[model samples]
Target chain A: MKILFIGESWHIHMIHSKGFDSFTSSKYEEGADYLLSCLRQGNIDVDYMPAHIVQTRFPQTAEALACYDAIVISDIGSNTFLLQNRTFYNMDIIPDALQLIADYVAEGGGLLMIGGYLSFTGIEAKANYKNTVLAEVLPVDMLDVDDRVELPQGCKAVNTAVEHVITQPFSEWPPLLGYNKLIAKENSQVLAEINGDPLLVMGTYHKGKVCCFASDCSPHWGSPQFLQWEHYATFWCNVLHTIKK
Target chain B: MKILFIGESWHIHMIHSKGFDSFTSSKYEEGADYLLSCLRQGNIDVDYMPAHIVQTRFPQTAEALACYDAIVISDIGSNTFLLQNRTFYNMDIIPDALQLIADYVAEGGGLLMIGGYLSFTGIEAKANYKNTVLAEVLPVDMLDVDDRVELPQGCKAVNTAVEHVITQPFSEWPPLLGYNKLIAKENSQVLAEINGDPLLVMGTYHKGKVCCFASDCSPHWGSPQFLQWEHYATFWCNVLHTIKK
Candidate 1:
């Protein structure tokens, strides 16, 4: 599987170290990198790209998004690349990126959104996923800005949809260190939740698929939760293969 | 907690003999009785009321409603009692009974609705729950006239709020054998889902508590899903405690 990644890699230090309390500049690179490593370890094929590298010059190239089997968005909110008016990324802006990804999925491509403090309706409430075309296909709702950032410990998971294709191989809990907040859509399947909020959700949009992991993949913040559990990596790979296959 | 149950006693014969495709009386009484037995086994206080007895009264008097901690409505939908304008087990009228129940709940009573082809929007599709004061507090949108019954074998469950107090004790598989289809209110907590729809939900209105189980308790429709699992009983007891406590 080939993945196009976007967002800031160094943002983790902020939410934990300093009092920035912001999710801006935070990226999903760590999680994506972890997923790629997992895919390779599992004998799966994968290609990875950071959003900044191509957002300015390559995204507009038309052929830019054609190669990958899936796309992953981490820390970058809609304003960073998709809402910027300069159009440096060509039509590869966030919203357009989603539309193209949706088109790709219709033709058989997969999309995964990794959670960071900023990814789903980011810090300062900048993750504008709700007001975009992406909302139409996502399994959960983006924050309306009023949603608070929740820090919880030891969240338990249960599968209400036991026989779904995605759940076939995973009958056990996939340890999640921390998670953000998202509302499950009316018809969407909620795989896991923390303190009553949706944490992991999988849904289909048209012919494509979308999954949201409402947690950060970095250290300290995602700490023992990510490092201590083997299912973390397996879960991502499982989702990717399930969607693509 | 004291719970007054309204449904049939030997009604099990109807479900075991008739089947979903065939029109038959739901043995809600047997299920309610079984649940009552389970609760008592768990040391919970309960007051049982058979369907025929409660069918003639409206509210049965505010004092009677307050006497018990909660009320469980099974098998017979608003069609048999409420919409028919029948005197509910000695009450002046069905709506009056509901209004009295509503008043009792407002003043600190709890309510639980079990699923049958007749509850939520019934088989005949004219149950009064749709657009009634009771619907105002339910967890999902009730179909105007359809029960929206979810057949266990044909359905899949998704734990939207897996961490909810009620679902955390159960596993992801062993799908719920049955469910009632009720409309969700703005404040309800949807605990489980079937075929991507809300199957179990609970919430509060005024000072009262309410829970809806979108499935029949009879063995024919519910089978091993509801009858075989110990969690079903635990779930009911836990839910009763959640509201009243």
Candidate 2:
């Protein structure tokens, strides 16, 4: 599937001293490049772009966003694209971005929000998504106030529904140590809950599918399961491929 | 502490029922009498009144409800009291009952809603608690819908916030097979969760404490744990006695 990825690409510099680059040091470009290479090797076509590099110089239009099959949003909270004096703020930029995303989903596009301190509802609580149209499309409620979710210690996954398509086949997900927590809206079908909160969910909005993995694909901020399991890439590929099919 | 219990008592008959009771389908007075006797045996002074019998005959005054330390509501939805009939429109009963309950809580009376098909957003979806003063003191939002909560098969108790005072010292609660469910509000502390939803919650409003248990304390509805465990009584007694202290 043709996917458009929009986010920042920044190098990390810790306050005191640092030797090895940790997970947070990963730039959006590096992550997207890894994902694209993985998809291409699996014979899936993905067109990726780094928003900071491109949107800084030129405006991102709805038509540009609509050219893809799905869009992956990361790190960039809404304000960066919508606020004036911020990168990517043409009058048409945000309106078009929203309109295109809504339209894309209505026409069966796939949208996925990965977990990062700032993805669903970021570190500083900049992910005020619930009041917006994006909230209607998400499979989970965006934390309107706080983003720091402490996953319950010794997490136990409760499968609330037996016939849930996502979990029925998998007896266990590669043991995840922690996850970014998000609130489930009334309409959402929670596929898995850990520590009394939603861990995985998928829901339909209009004609499209929205899925959320409330944890990062990277370490410390994400579940250790992602690093240890080989099925991690396969799982994402399967979920995304389901959308394509 | 003096608690006033309100609701119907009946020799409940259903297709597949458990237990046996042969008392003249009594009232809340009978249950309250039993509960009060147990408390008094322990030297706790409690006052019991069956409002359905008393209020049905003699007209109610706000003073009647104000004379209690706490109020336990069960087996009755708003229909019995808030219905638009002669007793509601012509008589001074409806407003008097509501005002008394409201003022009682506002004046620091403890309020506990125990589960019955007729309670929280009761059966047939007529709990009608919203837009009422009682809603003000509830820890969780009232469902404006139905009461029949179907627990997941093999539902298990989840000990959330184990370090919480209620759960820390007590390693395990008597396991409950199923429970009537109450959706938790954003601000409340969910003391225990069942199948990932709040089963017991303690909420605050002004000076009063509101606790809700989504299970019938009497026979046929609760976990066998209810009969086997002393924590139930201890928990309620602690809530009531601690408030006075």
Candidate 3:
């Protein structure tokens, strides 16, 4: 199955902010690597659209998105989709992508949102998806304020639904450094959790199936051990295969 | 022909820059040490221009550049050449180094750019050559945004053009931890690839021969397996021999 993978990438211009010296460096990082490698090698046809490019590349209509059996989004914020150049310039209006995504889901496309600083309600409420159409379609509801729970000590993934097909192939699971707090809706299935909050949720939006993974597919949160895990490939591939349109 | 290798070295001098602190630390090392020794071991005449001294050591004029057969760049960003002490400290304008490199290539110079965190579009576009002249001369086109492809789980390289001269020395290949995502340009030949994107592309700019290797010549991105490959030294020597000006 084909998937349109979006987000989980960002560029930073870090400042030294020093009192006596001025040194600076910028970095571009993508948190999608490990999972994407796993999915693609598992023979799932996945096309990556990094966060920076989402402004121009993410599909604007359900029809344009129909070519993909599913879409997986991660750390990228709603701003990348909401603030197209023309929209920001007030020159005209483009179809709101998140709205289109919800429509895509209703029309039988699969969608998944992986956790990050920009996923769910996000840090500082900056990802701001709670107010968007996605809120109505997602399997879990985001909090009004920041939903992040930083667990530097790390949190282990516990399978709350022992018989879920997606968790069947896993012999072991790795811990995460952090995650967004999510509440599974009544129609959703809470398969796993971290910090006692819903970490993996599955639900339906009309004719479509969707999943929400409350932790990252890559690091700073996924942890070194998580990335090196042998089950890492099986886990993501199973998720996509189980949820594919 | 003689060659000039740029970058892969840095110096750090930490001072009493800490609040209520008096300790300081300083150190200098060459990242290119291993690669240089490998090329030298092959009896290739090459000289290095480390990152720290490049502001003064990098050639500034065509006359000064005539002696060099080619320039090999790795992990060196465009900033170093463009932001000399005069330009950076005083905000004075300077010759565009990228333009000079392109002209040099057109005049029949052989050019090869090895990859790293600070190469191609780089992490967060810090290596930013996509907007520079070298982007046009290279055998591959860089992503307009960040182009890094991190595979913490590691990825194997495929020798698609195994019958080609560059691939003749090897019967096996090693896995790389990461690489820049590069697109092979039209009329370019892809000798090797990782994740289906061009890993080693060979092409021409005007009268010059140019080669772009998508992965690093060193470690971190280039794994221990890659660095320790039996044909590692011979592979680079083979490249230099093929593209030397």
Candidate 4:
């Protein structure tokens, strides 16, 4: 499957200082590296649009978006898609990329949103997807405030819909460090739950399939144990397969 | 005094669904509005740059950056400075904006970083500036892992440097909801602490002065009590004055 993955790369700038002297340096890192590698191993052709690229590079036309069988949004917020340089600086009107994604999904595209600080309602409600067009296509409802539910002590996922294709391959799930607090939609099927709240929810939006994995696909929410799980690759592959079915 | 404020705008998208029907809409919101208005009320000349605008519009040259006496970075991550559209998509080389900020600070520019999920080490370490050039100029060190310290019951600030200009107007500080966990550098002055950890630190980097307020100036971290405090504007103005002095 041809998939589009957006967000999850960050550039870190550090300065080392001693006495009156200082030196500056920077490095680039991607949280999606592990997840993307797993998907690649599953033979999924993926194109990544890091957060910075989304403003200008996110496909403006529905036809351009059709190239991907599915789109996975992780650790990216709605502002990256809503306000381009033109709109932000010149107040110029541009195509609403969020609306484009909604339309694409209605035309039978598959979409999944994996949670992080900037996902769902995110930290301080800055993610604010609760009021977006993309929220209509997802199977979960975002909290209006900071939605992060920190489980520093860790929590285990319990299979709610063990018979579903997405959950059939896994009997026991690894512990997740934390997850976004979300309410599963009434029409959605909860495949998994952690602490009696939704962890994985799946549903259909018009002719398209949508899912919300209410936790990070990478650490610290995914945790070292979850990333090291042998079924990590298989679980994500299954998610893709189920969504694209 | 002139100031440049970057980051703190979000586009909210909401989806309403009922059985087989759904509708979506989006709106824009900014966390910087209150802070900006407060600065204006204090008669501080300020230029505001929302997070999305940082990719292209962030000061490109040191001369351009020198226009502002002080720069306030809030709710924006290091990636917005490190990676631009050209670098992300075409793999083209671009100026390291974070390094520029560091250099500017060292050359006598005033800099302050207020906390949020995307500030300091941030949630899940996705802000990831622990080792950046900018980090060296700051008065505190970032945690390598997820650095958020959530305080649901609230935490009061303890003034460690009672004589410092930034703390001159306050005897009793309002409680913060949460803050990024950071270690104050040995050469820096720890102005305040929350739960025995650094809440505010200030220091000089070469010819420039820098400060780190390890909590938000807005909600989530800046809870209702903190925002409604009569000294909120006075506190931020004092920070600017201290850094600019």
DockQ of every model listed?
0.01, 0.01, 0.01, 0.02
For A1-245, candidate 1 gives per-residue lDDT tens digits of: 55655545542322334574533232232444555567677766665555555354335433556676667777666544443333321211123455555566565566778777567765545565664557676788875553345455655555655366555555555455556678888877787666677777887877777788777666434657565565666666777776662
Instruction: List candidate 1 segments past 4 Å from native.
Output: A1-245, B9-29, B57-59, B83-95, B150-152
Residue A165's lDDT within candidate 3 is 81
Give per-residue lDDT, candidate 3, residue B193.
Answer: 80
Which tens-of-lDDT digit does each residue in B1-245 have in candidate 4? 99888867767886554433455689876586888889999979999887767876666789998878988899788887788766787797788989888888888999999998899977656687876788788888877655666554467888885487778767788877678888888888888899788988888999998989999897666876787899898889989988883
Clashing pairs in 3: A27-B124, A28-B123, A28-B124
Candidate 4 deviant stretches above 4 angstroms: A1-245, B15-23
Residues B1-245 of candidate 2 have per-residue lDDT tens digits of 56766655553322233477322221122243344455565555665444355345422565766667777776566545543243432322134255456666777777877776666766555554553446667887765446556542435466676345555545466655455667787777777776667777877667777777776665445555555576655555665554441
lDDT of 2 at B129: 55
Instruction: In candidate 2, list every pair of residues with a backbone clash.
Output: A118-A122
Best by DockQ: 4
Q: Number of clashing pairs, model 1?
A: 34
lDDT of 1 at B29: 32
Best by lDDT: 4
TM-score of chain B of 2: 0.75
TM-score of chain B of 1: 0.80
For TM-score, candidate 2 versus 4, the one ahead is 4
In candidate 2, what are the lDDT values of residues A46-99, reduced to their tens digit?
755565543453335556565667776765565554452442344442343555
Scored against the true structure, residue B202 in model 2 reaches a CA lDDT of 79
Q: Candidate 4: what is its chain A TM-score? A: 0.93
**Per-prediction TM-score to the true structure, in the order listed:** 0.44, 0.44, 0.55, 0.51
